[PDB]
Ligand binder design. Structure first.
Ligand SMILES: Nc1nc2c(ncn2[C@H]2C[C@H](O)[C@@H](COP(=O)(O)OP(=O)(O)OP(=O)(O)O)O2)c(=O)[nH]1
Ligand SMILES: [Ca+2]
Ligand SMILES: [Ca+2]
Ligand SMILES: [Ca+2]
Ligand SMILES: [Ca+2]
Ligand SMILES: [Ca+2]
Length: 901
DNA sequence: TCGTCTAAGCAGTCCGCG
DNA sequence: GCGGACTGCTTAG
């Protein structure tokens, strides 16, 4: 097999690399890597190295990495560009792995761990590490084993050994329900003291040294706690054994309001799963506790115990250990589903970066582009300092707030990357500028043609057409990968709909789920077999189809995020290829493209319907248009359709055979007008929306920009078994909206869109009557909480104190003196409830840490004083009045002359 | 919330608006 | 009450 790196570090003048050799074995080596950098040189000097602009360069070979770094400094002192890859480990990987890396994940040691620390006096601060570590569960992916290190004797209590037999039993047997599929994979090690536990942990770690290290909050909690605790007990040298190169660094992570410390372990790649989840999941959650996320992702019940966590070990050590094991397993289950580790390895090896660098699109693109240019003996420019400057983005059309019965939407495939490719936008392809007309003049094709030579953007930039820039070349490669995975995702989705249909008629038999690849559209043979399957088999198949869809989603959406991130990186001052000329070339072209095509679509449809000045495009945002199809349906007449699926078919056909060819023609003209390199503006139909045939549903509504709802029957070629709501921006989609309120508002919208006014009025009346019985957590608003200290004046709200911060201050006063009460953590999320006039808390609201029950000390008082009236008006009635006034209907029945009887 | 970008919505504070 | 200036937070893209 081909060799591949596991980790790489620079330590002084050495590269330390862990790698898999040609025999599949893990090795480590120290290499006195001599880096090269570059300087511009005269024409007369013959060289093979050229900078991205074609200027000749001489290569400078350094005796060591420190010499190279010092040279860079002196070049700055002189005022001359020092060219080349200044991150020497990236240069090392590029030299050592000069081919497309094929990696074997089965050889990569992925460790998932979690620790427990009993603490009487509140949260155990990792930088202090003053409390014993009393449990560690460490899963090793190569062994496929959970290694459990259990402390039996502690200053906080002596306990009995954990029992695997009780752990395996049902909760209803008094057991812990540790899943049977992991029972035989547990290696349990009890210890009579913490020193021996930690010494044995370190010896184990030496034997089974993680390459990828993950878990939940491991970077901010578990790693620093373990490092600092070992440091406190044994000294620094012992703690540094967590690094295979015995080198660690405290790294200060800074943000707007403060900073925190993490421990960098040289020779390990830490990918904290909470951070992987935040970057790759495309969710915004009210809480990021593992229990909350586990419930959301896996539909598993919260890990239930009595008393505070600080007393769990002494009261129920059995459960304490079991829950530690389950916590580790839950992260593995989330990963089995989401496949974020797989994604990280894919992107990391593709770019040839340290795997942990997948968190940084700038680092990722820097490496991809460097490797690409190096292949042609081209030399990358020095990174420069730039001041942060605002620049313009997308165009968003102001919609007329209204109901919209029939809607078809269209949008560009990978819009910004396609613009980069079409225009040929790259650092080295800038050809010059032209005199810009107002955007409106390009949109309306009255401005003079920008260039007869170069490819243009309406921001005034011109680009070479003779050859692809490195940015278009590399962005295309990742786009092609994204397209492959999106294909698999969409097939799995369509396959899921076939199974849902079959589930209407499940057969009474005992059989098995079919062994199929859900990434490919089901053959006729498979479809026939599906129609004969039991509900049990069909449901298992649906689960598997949906898991395949999730895997495809992760792979496609994050590759889309990577390529969109390059468009963004061009507008970030830390990017080597920062250039506001290019960043704005993209966004300004986009503004034109949208408004150009709005004009073209309106023109096409006015012609088809034989009208003039009629607005068919009702809305658009960035790269999308929403077209009213009422007139198209009416040209046929509703009574001519057999059912809903019949008109959906008709619109699908109209979009594919009439609309899209008109759109394509419109964009081809725009490409010619801008003299672009290649036509790549592909605006395919997204949604087909409308009410059920014969219903009083309104189909859709807009309240304003980025705020709308649509009843969708077909989405990107997926024909749904049941209509699905596409809701954007409304309160149902916001993590700040109470859970039960999102639910209720979604049902109000469903009724509006599918059933009509009377149905909405029936539901509203019921919700208003019953909502006070809803659990307090389900009706609490959620907010992130920043700058709590800024607004805290002697425990009371200072000037301009935000509502949620006021709630936190109320909470802090209510729990004052308690070392044990859950503290609100700066920058994390809180639940917020309004309080009735004259409450004991002395203010109008209270807030507490999200994802948790409020502490028992005050729970009773909160429940008693919760202001249901304010809650209802603010979170439910206000948004609903917004929806209904936009859609021109009433959520309450107005009086009529019929009331006289 | 360490980690690519801008546009734009709504909640809430403070205070004007005769 | 509402709106604007402003902060804070959260979306759509
Ligand atoms: N710089 C930057 N631009 C973004 C980001 N998200 C969206 N955009 C811009 C770039 C996208 O191409 C454009 C349109 O967004 P879409 O959500 O329609 O995605 P896109 O067209 O890329 O992919 P699609 O093929 O429609 O799934 O909006 C981002 O995180 N950073
Ligand atoms: Ca725990
Ligand atoms: Ca798009
Ligand atoms: Ca599409
Ligand atoms: Ca059947
Ligand atoms: Ca779009």
């Amino acid at each position: 097999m081909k060799e591949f790196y596991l980790t790489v570090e620079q330590i002084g003048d050495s590269i330390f690399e862990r790698y898999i050799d040609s025999n599949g074995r893990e090795r480590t080596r120290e290499v006195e890597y001599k880096p090269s950098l570059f300087a511009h040189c005269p024409e007369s000097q013959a060289t093979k190295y050229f900078d991205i602009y074609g200027k000749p360069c001489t290569r400078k070979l350094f005796a060591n990495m420190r010499d190279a770094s010092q040279w860079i400094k002196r070049m700055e002192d002189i005022g001359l560009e020092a060219l080349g890859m200044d991150d020497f480990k990236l240069a090392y990987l590029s030299d050592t792995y000069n081919y497309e890396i094929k990696y074997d994940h089965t050889k990569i040691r992925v460790a998932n761990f979690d620790i427990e620390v009993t603490s009487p006096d509140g949260f155990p601060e990792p930088s202090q590490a003053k409390h014993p570590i009393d449990a560690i569960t460490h899963y090793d992916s190569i062994d496929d084993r959970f290694y459990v290190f259990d402390l039996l004797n502690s200053p906080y209590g002596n306990v009995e050994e954990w029992s695997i037999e009780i752990a395996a039993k049902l909760q209803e047997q008094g057991g812990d329900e540790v899943p049977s599929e992991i029972i035989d994979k547990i290696i349990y090690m009890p210890f009579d003291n913490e020193k021996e536990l930690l010494m044995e942990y370190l010896n184990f770690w030496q034997q089974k040294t993680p390459v990828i290290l993950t878990g939940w909050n491991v970077e901010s909690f578990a790693i620093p706690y373990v490092y600092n605790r070992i440091k406190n007990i044994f000294g620094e040298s012992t703690a540094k054994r967590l690094s295979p190169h015995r080198k660690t660094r405290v790294k200060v992570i800074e943000n707007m309001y403060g900073s925190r410390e993490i421990i960098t372990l040289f020779g390990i790649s830490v990918l904290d799963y909470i951070d992987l989840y935040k970057k790759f999941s495309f969710t915004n959650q009210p809480s990021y506790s593992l229990d909350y996320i586990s419930e959301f992702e896996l539909n598993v019940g919260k890990l239930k115990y009595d008393g505070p966590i600080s007393k769990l070990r002494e009261s129920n050590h059995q459960r304490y250990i079991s829950y530690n094991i389950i916590a580790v397993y839950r992260v593995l289950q989330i990963d089995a589903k989401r496949q974020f580790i797989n994604l990280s390895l894919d992107m990391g090896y593709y770019a040839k970066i340290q795997i942990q660098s997948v968190f940084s699109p700038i680092k990722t693109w820097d490496a991809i582009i460097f490797n690409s240019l190096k292949e042609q003996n081209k030399v990358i420019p020095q990174g420069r300092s730039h001041p942060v400057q605002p620049y313009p983005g997308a165009f968003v059309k102001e919609p007329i707030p209204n109901r919209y019965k029939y809607v078809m939407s269209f949008d560009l495939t990978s819009a910004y990357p396609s613009i980069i490719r079409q225009v040929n936008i790259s650092p080295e392809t800038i050809a010059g500028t032209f005199k810009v007309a107002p955007l409106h003049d390009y949109i309306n094709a009255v401005a003079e043609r920008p260039s007869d030579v170069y490819s243009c953007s309406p921001n005034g930039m011109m680009y070479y057409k003779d050859r692809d820039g490195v940015v278009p070349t590399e962005i295309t490669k990742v786009f092609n990968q994204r397209k492959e995975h999106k294909g698999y995702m969409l097939a799995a989705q369509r396959n899921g709909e076939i199974i849902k249909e079959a589930l209407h008629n499940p057969n009474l038999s005992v059989d098995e789920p079919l062994d199929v690849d859900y990434r490919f559209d089901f053959s006729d043979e498979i479809k026939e077999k599906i129609k004969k399957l039991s509900a049990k088999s069909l449901n298992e198949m649906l689960f598997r189809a949906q898991r395949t869809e999730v895997a495809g989603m992760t792979a496609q959406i994050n590759r889309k995020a990577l390529i969109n991130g390059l468009a963004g990186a061009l507008g970030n001052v830390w990017f080597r290829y920062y250039d506001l000329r290019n960043a704005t070339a993209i966004t300004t072209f986009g503004q034109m493209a949208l408004q150009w095509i709005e004009r073209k679509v309106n023109e096409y449809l006015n012609e088809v319907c034989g009208t003039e000045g009629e607005a068919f495009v009702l809305y658009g945002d960035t790269d999308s248009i929403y077209v009213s199809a009422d007139k198209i349906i009416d040209k046929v007449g509703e009574s001519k359709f057999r059912d809903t699926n019949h008109w959906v078919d008709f619109l699908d056909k109209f979009a594919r055979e009439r609309m899209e060819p008109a759109i394509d023609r419109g964009f081809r003209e725009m490409c010619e007008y801008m003299n672009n390199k290649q036509h790549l503006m592909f605006m395919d139909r997204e949604a087909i929306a409308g009410p059920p045939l014969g219903s009083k549903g309104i189909g859709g509504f807009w309240t304003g920009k980025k705020r709308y709802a649509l009843n969708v029957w077909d989405m990107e070629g997926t024909r749904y078994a049941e209509p699905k709501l596409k809701i954007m921006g409304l309160e149902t989609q916001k993590s700040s909206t109470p859970k039960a309120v999102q639910k209720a508002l979604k049902e109000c919208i469903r009724r509006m869109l599918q059933e009509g006014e009377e149905s909405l009025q029936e539901y509203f009346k019921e919700f208003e009557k019953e909502f006070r019985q809803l659990n307090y957590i389900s009706i609490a608003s959620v907010s992130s909480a920043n700058n709590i200290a800024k607004y805290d004046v002697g425990g009371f709200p200072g000037p301009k104190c935000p509502f949620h911060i006021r709630g936190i201050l109320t909470y802090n006063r209510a729990i004052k003196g308690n070392i044990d009460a859950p503290q609100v953590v700066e920058g994390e999320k809180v639940y917020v409830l309004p309080l009735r006039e004259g409450n004991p808390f002395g203010d109008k609201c209270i807030a507490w840490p999200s994802g948790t029950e409020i502490t028992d000390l005050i729970k009773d008082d909160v429940l008693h004083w919760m202001d249901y009236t304010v809650l209802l008006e603010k979170t439910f009635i206000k948004p609903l009045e917004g929806f209904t006034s936009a859609a021109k209907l009433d959520y309450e029945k107005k009086a009529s002359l019929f009331d006289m009887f």
